[PDB]
């Protein structure tokens, strides 16, 4: 009996298949989150600066109140 | 001459706090010096104990 190297292909490994595809981001939907984070960013920040004004006037009031200084 | 009355009235203010409600005043004084120069930040919770005794 002769024994040589046997042939096997099975699945053929798929000859040239695309793996690159669009994922997560679509296009217009990313701008809704992108610019949406900006509008949420300013509104949250400016409310803190209005709360800073409560401290600001109260800080300068200490100088006016102190005349024996 | 007017400045002489300023320093005399300054002693009158602090003596009234030392006589009545001294416990909230000392606790508020320890809060302001433990921090840097926030003055009113991270001390508003201890500020609630103050003024309430003085309101009487």
Swiss-Prot record, chain A:
Domain of life, source organism: Eukaryota
TM annotation in the entry: 27-46
Subcellular localization: Mitochondrion inner membrane; Nucleus
UniProt family annotation: Belongs to the complex I NDUFA13 subunit family.
Biological function: Accessory subunit of the mitochondrial membrane respiratory chain NADH dehydrogenase (Complex I), that is believed not to be involved in catalysis. Complex I functions in the transfer of electrons from NADH to the respiratory chain. The immediate electron acceptor for the enzyme is believed to be ubiquinone. Involved in the interferon/all-trans-retinoic acid (IFN/RA) induced cell death. This apoptotic activity is inhibited by interaction with viral IRF1. Prevents the transactivation of STAT3 target genes.
Subunit-level organization: Complex I is composed of 45 different subunits. Interacts with CARD15, but not with CARD4. Interacts with STAT3, but not with STAT1, STAT2 and STAT5A. Interacts with OLFM4.
Protein name as annotated: NADH dehydrogenase [ubiquinone] 1 alpha subcomplex subunit 13
Curated annotation (Swiss-Prot), chain B:
Compartments, as annotated in UniProt: Mitochondrion inner membrane; Mitochondrion intermembrane space; Mitochondrion
Positions of the CHCH domain: 18-56
UniProt free text on domains: Contains four C-X9-C motifs that are predicted to form a helix-coil-helix structure, permitting the formation of intramolecular disulfide bonds.
Full protein segment contained here: 58 to 113 of 172
Record's function text: Accessory subunit of the mitochondrial membrane respiratory chain NADH dehydrogenase (Complex I), that is believed not to be involved in catalysis. Complex I functions in the transfer of electrons from NADH to the respiratory chain. The immediate electron acceptor for the enzyme is believed to be ubiquinone.
Disulfide bonds: 21-53, 31-43
The family this protein is said to belong to: Belongs to the complex I NDUFA8 subunit family.
Motif (Cx9C motif 4): 43-53
Gene: NDUFA8
Coiled coil: none
Motif placement: Cx9C motif 3: 21-31
Upper lineage: Eukaryota, Metazoa, Chordata, Craniata, Vertebrata
Motif (Cx9C motif 2) on chain: 1-9
Protein name: NADH dehydrogenase [ubiquinone] 1 alpha subcomplex subunit 8
Subunit description: Complex I is composed of 45 different subunits.
Domain of life: Eukaryota
């Amino acid at each position: 009996x002769x024994x040589x190297x046997x042939x096997x292909x099975x699945x053929x490994x798929x000859x040239x298949x695309x793996x690159x595809x669009x994922x997560x981001x679509x296009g217009y939907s990313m701008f809704a989150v992108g610019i949406g984070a900006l509008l949420f960013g300013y509104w949250s920040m400016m409310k803190w600066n209005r709360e800073r004004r409560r401290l600001q006037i109260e800080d300068f009031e200490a100088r006016i109140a102190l005349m024996p200084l | 001459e007017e400045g002489k009355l300023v320093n005399q009235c300054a002693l009158e203010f602090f003596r009234q706090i030392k006589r009545h409600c001294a416990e909230p005043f000392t606790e508020y004084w320890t809060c302001i010096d433990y921090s840097g120069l926030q003055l009113f930040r991270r001390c508003r919770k201890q500020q609630a104990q103050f003024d309430e005794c003085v309101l009487d």
